[PDB]
Amino acid sequence: PTNRLNAVQRQHLDQALAWLRGCVAPTADLRLDSREIEPGDVFVACPSDGRQFMDQALARGASAILYETEGASVAPVGAQALPVAQLRTLLGALADEWYGRPSQDLSVVAITGTNGKTSCTQWLAQVLTRMGKPCGSIGTLGALLPDGQSLPDVLTMHRTLARMRAAGARAVALEASSIGIEQGRLDHIRIAVAGFTNLYHGTMQRYEQAKAALFQWPDLQAAVVNADDPAGERLLASLPAALKTGYSLQGAPADVHARDLQATAHGQVFTLALPDGEAQIVTRLLGQHNISNLLLVAGALSKLGWPLPQIARELAAISPVDGRLQAVTPVPLQHALVVVDYAHTPDALARALTALRPVAQARGGRLVCVFGCGGERDPGKRPEMGRIAVERADRVVVTSDNPRSESPQDIIDQILAGIPAGMRAAVQPDRALAIMQTLWSAAPDDVILLAGKGHETYQDIGGRKLPFDDRQWARLALLLPHAGAVSTDTRRIGRGELFVALSGENFDGHDYLPQAQSAGACAAVVAHPVADVALPQLVLGDTLAALGRMGTAWRSSFTLPVVAVTGSNGKTTTKEMISAILAQWQGDDGRLATAGNFNNEIGVPLTLLRLRARHRAAVFELGMNHPGEIERLAAMAAPTVALVTNAQRHQEFHTVEAVAHENGAVIGALPEDGVAVYPGDEPYAAIWDKLAGARRVLRFGLQPGLDVYAERVVTQAHGTQCGVVTPAGSAGLDLPVPGLHNLRNALAAIACGLAAGAPLHTCIAALAGFQA
């Protein structure tokens, strides 16, 4: 609020300036906060005890003190103290003169409003710099130079302008506020253009009246006012035509208009109409509020003298603000539209979905909303958001969103309670799984909204903020269906494969990203970025945990018999026998089997990621070293047939009974219609019998009366001949591998082959022909 100093105040100012100019360096900064004083600065003390600050400024090297003479019960004994009458009222002029009148040489654009200060000031700074007038910005993100380097009371304002000018800035866009204008944060700033974004049942009048007083300030060239807002319309009506530029999205008579706004599959198309012509603009920004902001930017630029083709061209190239209906850009591959928004309240979610519907219509696809609600926050939003999502989106997936210390399922159940009877939402509590599964089942024309986190890069689970970025997971989901193979070993990684940078052992896989790049990897999953490596990096945090979720999600996209093999001994031999059966049953190309020793928390998800549409049956070997591994691996593999080969007691965690329960967990992962296969002639069958519950059970062994057992056993040095008795019939078997343990492995394979759907004759033929 530039106060016009009368002749006496100007004289008083000149006295203060002449004194300051005589006793401190021309580079001295004027500071009001004694804590920020650096040697050579001037402390301006305008306070009930000034001494706790005046002494500090002197202790910190202040070269002079300006103090107000009305009411001060502080003054140091004998320093460079200057009494200044009305010091508070002169600070703007003092700062303006001390820093060489920085606003006199800058085109200062001050933008105010509720939802356009940050966007408009930054886009103006971006566009003007690209148009050849280097423009700095001041606002929520700090004071930035035209080149983006990061650098507020009235002295700081003038000081910041001075630094920008010294760095070559010729214009400054700054966020203004009604409070700032009233409180005097802008005093003696020469404002060239003031922009108004917007001004609801309240006292709008004081805000408008406060702002209109602003427009009878000196050196204003133009006022850019939103004509779509009722308060804005009244302000425009009161301003002389020469100063006012109105903009309107909805067709109110204004100088600047957007017409024919149409959402496209990747953005919006509208005709920008300025007094001096019209131009079609194709932009990737989503939402009418973003269009309104461009009109403010366009109006300011048009009144500042920039021609329409250049305005249209530059406005057309603006990038969406992170986390505000930001479209996720897929990883470029040499050979669905996913949108992320910080919609974590009911109203915000509704607006985002409303904003995305015309885009979905332009694409001919469904609007899919993936969202969760935070725990230990406002429970009242959870049912409401469920209703909004299902009322306004075509498909809704409810997932966890920073559940913190609450149970994720309880939050989901509360959300679902708000979804009207007859509408359904899918539930996937693991947000990473929700993203991958939703994106992989979506048609290319669908619009998927990942709502909630926006710019947030963590998930808070149980008090730990774990790295999680909706954008990175969407990028992974878009890449993975097209990647050749997933590899964790740079010695073996091929062209077009995804490299997983594992952290562990002796040599942290992150150190080998240049090699992966040289080997032609298509992307790398990494825990943290790495500078100067051009290989696209998907930052997914814990790469081992990410890999498990990747494997789990990929497995969930296929419906086929899956044999999970676990046990103390014979897993690999049995798995190979089962693999032989599947090859005999479905063909070599229709089967997937664990290769080598890929049976741990790394190998198993890597094997899962090899599943393709051609496979018709799969066998996975599951290995264990620590408690909980079988549960984790079996849950990941989601088997339809679970085999326990045997229970034999290493005491890392020690009884055979304890081993039976751990290995038995694969049976716990079976669906209701799954088949449990375990040895029936061992003393511990009861543990596995109970765990199997009501599921179909095939018990195998050497005792008559089991479901799959051998009779007439003839063991020779090189193999075993026997009659095999199964529920599907009886057949002779010449098993070309010696030993009773191998015969048991063969019986397990027959039981698993039969449970998976292979005909008995196929099982026998495969095993009769089996090679070690």
Side-chain angles (χ1 to χ4, degrees), residues 1 3 5-20 22-54 56-69 71-72 75-87 89-125 127-132 134-164 166-169 171-178 180-182 184 186-189 191-199 202 205 208 210 212-213 215 218-232 235-249 251-280 282-283 285-312 314-332 336-365 367-375 377-390 392-394 396-404 406-423 425-463 466-470 472-486 488-490 494 496 498 500-505 508-512 514 516 519-529 531 533-534 536-538 540-568 570-575 577-590 592-597 599-609 611-615 617-624 627-630 632-648 656 658-671 673-683 685-689 691-770 772:
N3 209 63
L5 296 174
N6 64 41
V8 174
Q9 290 176 312
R10 185 71 208 195
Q11 288 182 350
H12 291 352
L13 176 64
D14 288 342
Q15 284 180 14
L17 284 166
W19 185 79
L20 284 173
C23 61
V24 297
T27 55
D29 286 331
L30 309 179
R31 304 186 191 264
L32 284 169
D33 190 62
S34 58
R35 297 168 293 112
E36 293 295 329
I37 291 293
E38 298 180 345
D41 289 347
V42 180
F43 183 56
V44 184
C46 54
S48 63
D49 283 339
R51 216 55 183 270
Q52 294 178 353
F53 300 104
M54 289 185 80
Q56 183 180 17
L58 287 170
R60 286 185 63 123
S63 294
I65 298 173
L66 300 177
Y67 68 98
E68 189 47 59
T69 46
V77 183
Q80 294 295 310
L82 181 72
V84 184
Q86 299 181 314
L87 180 56
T89 65
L90 297 107
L91 289 181
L94 177 66
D96 189 52
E97 291 303 328
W98 178 255
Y99 291 115
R101 301 178 293 256
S103 62
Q104 296 296 102
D105 298 321
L106 298 167
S107 300
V108 178
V109 185
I111 308 184
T112 191
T114 302
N115 49 61
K117 301 183 213 296
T118 299
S119 296
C120 291
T121 54
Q122 291 173 186
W123 290 339
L124 194 51
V127 168
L128 283 168
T129 298
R130 282 192 302 216
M131 287 178 120
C135 181
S137 63
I138 302 95
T140 303
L141 296 181
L144 302 89
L145 296 173
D147 60 3
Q149 287 181 85
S150 176
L151 295 178
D153 67 331
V154 190
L155 299 188
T156 301
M157 284 294 176
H158 280 96
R159 183 173 115 221
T160 301
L161 291 175
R163 287 181 178 121
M164 287 180 172
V172 174
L174 65 86
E175 301 180 31
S177 72
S178 196
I181 294 168
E182 298 171 346
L186 297 176
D187 191 356
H188 286 82
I189 297 294
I191 299 284
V193 180
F196 279 55
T197 294
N198 65 78
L199 299 173
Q205 185 86 5
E208 182 276 340
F215 293 91
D219 301 321
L220 186 64
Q221 294 174 25
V224 185
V225 179
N226 186 359
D228 292 323
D229 188 82
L235 188 58
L236 283 169
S238 304
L239 289 171
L243 288 178
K244 64 181 180 184
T245 302
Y247 68 89
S248 176
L249 181 66
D255 303 359
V256 185
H257 306 270
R259 298 181 182 278
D260 303 317
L261 183 71
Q262 296 180 354
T264 71
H266 301 66
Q268 301 178 80
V269 183
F270 68 101
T271 300
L272 173 66
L274 298 176
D276 172 78
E278 301 180 355
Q280 193 89 350
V282 184
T283 178
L285 298 176
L286 304 171
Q288 288 183 13
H289 284 282
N290 279 276
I291 301 305
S292 180
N293 291 339
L294 283 54
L295 296 180
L296 185 157
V297 172
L301 290 168
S302 178
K303 200 104 178 181
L304 287 172
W306 293 97
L308 175 59
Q310 210 183 12
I311 292 171
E314 294 301 329
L315 289 188
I318 282 172
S319 300
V321 180
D322 288 350
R324 302 196 189 196
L325 289 181
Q326 178 186 17
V328 176
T329 306
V331 179
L337 177 64
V338 186
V339 181
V340 300
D341 195 65
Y342 65 96
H344 66 282
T345 68
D347 288 359
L349 183 60
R351 287 183 333 248
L353 290 169
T354 297
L356 288 173
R357 176 70 49 196
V359 179
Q361 288 173 341
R363 293 178 68 81
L367 180 57
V368 183
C369 179
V370 184
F371 79 106
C373 293
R377 298 320 181 78
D378 180 10
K381 67 179 183 180
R382 297 170 187 172
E384 274 299 287
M385 288 181 71
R387 185 184 57 83
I388 287 166
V390 75
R392 292 185 180 257
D394 300 302
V396 175
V397 181
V398 179
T399 187
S400 53
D401 186 9
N402 295 324
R404 297 176 176 99
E406 207 182 333
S407 168
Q409 189 58 52
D410 288 344
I411 293 171
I412 285 169
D413 289 343
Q414 290 173 51
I415 293 168
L416 293 178
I419 297 178
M423 297 190 243
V427 175
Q428 172 55 250
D430 188 315
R431 185 173 181 81
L433 293 181
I435 291 169
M436 289 185 289
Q437 290 171 342
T438 299
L439 272 64
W440 288 341
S441 67
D445 297 313
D446 286 348
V447 180
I448 302 171
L449 173 65
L450 309 178
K453 290 190 180 308
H455 181 59
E456 213 177 40
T457 58
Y458 63 89
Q459 177 91 325
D460 191 340
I461 53 172
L466 302 171
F468 193 97
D469 188 342
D470 283 345
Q472 296 296 319
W473 281 103
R475 285 177 60 156
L476 176 66
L478 290 169
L479 174 152
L480 192 58
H482 304 294
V486 179
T488 61
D489 188 349
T490 184
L498 180 133
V500 183
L502 300 176
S503 186
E505 291 182 334
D508 190 343
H510 292 80
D511 293 334
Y512 294 82
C522 65
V525 176
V526 297
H528 51 274
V533 180
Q537 301 180 325
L538 304 163
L540 296 180
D542 187 341
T543 54
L544 182 145
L547 180 58
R549 286 176 190 94
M550 293 166 60
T552 298
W554 193 255
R555 169 62 184 88
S556 73
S557 298
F558 298 86
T559 302
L560 63 99
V562 174
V563 183
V565 183
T566 190
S568 300
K571 300 182 294 293
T572 299
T573 301
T574 301
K575 180 207 61 59
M577 287 179 177
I578 293 165
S579 180
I581 289 169
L582 297 184
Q584 180 71 13
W585 180 35
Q586 299 295 336
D588 196 309
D589 287 337
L592 182 68
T594 302
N597 60 3
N599 59 5
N600 57 37
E601 290 185 53
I602 296 91
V604 168
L606 286 177
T607 44
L608 286 168
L609 287 165
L611 279 168
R612 301 292 181 281
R614 63 182 177 195
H615 294 121
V619 56
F620 297 139
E621 181 183 5
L622 311 181
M624 70 166 171
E629 192 182 320
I630 293 300
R632 285 191 302 267
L633 296 177
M636 189 184 300
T640 58
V641 184
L643 168 65
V644 182
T645 54
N646 60 2
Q648 297 175 337
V656 176
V659 174
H661 279 286
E662 173 63 16
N663 286 328
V666 192
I667 295 169
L670 284 169
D673 60 339
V675 182
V677 183
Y678 47 85
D681 52 356
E682 291 270 12
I687 292 308
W688 299 323
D689 212 337
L691 288 170
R695 294 177 182 92
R696 187 176 159 190
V697 175
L698 297 178
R699 298 172 180 100
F700 69 93
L702 299 177
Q703 290 183 351
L706 299 173
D707 300 297
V708 184
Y709 67 99
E711 65 183 359
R712 297 179 110 179
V713 180
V714 182
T715 55
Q716 301 176 296
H718 304 297
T720 302
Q721 297 85 343
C722 67
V724 297
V725 182
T726 77
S730 301
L733 174 65
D734 191 334
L735 184 65
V737 291
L740 290 66
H741 62 282
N742 279 326
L743 179 55
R744 285 183 166 109
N745 293 337
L747 295 173
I750 289 167
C752 288
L754 293 175
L760 178 57
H761 191 71
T762 56
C763 298
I764 297 302
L767 292 181
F770 181 73

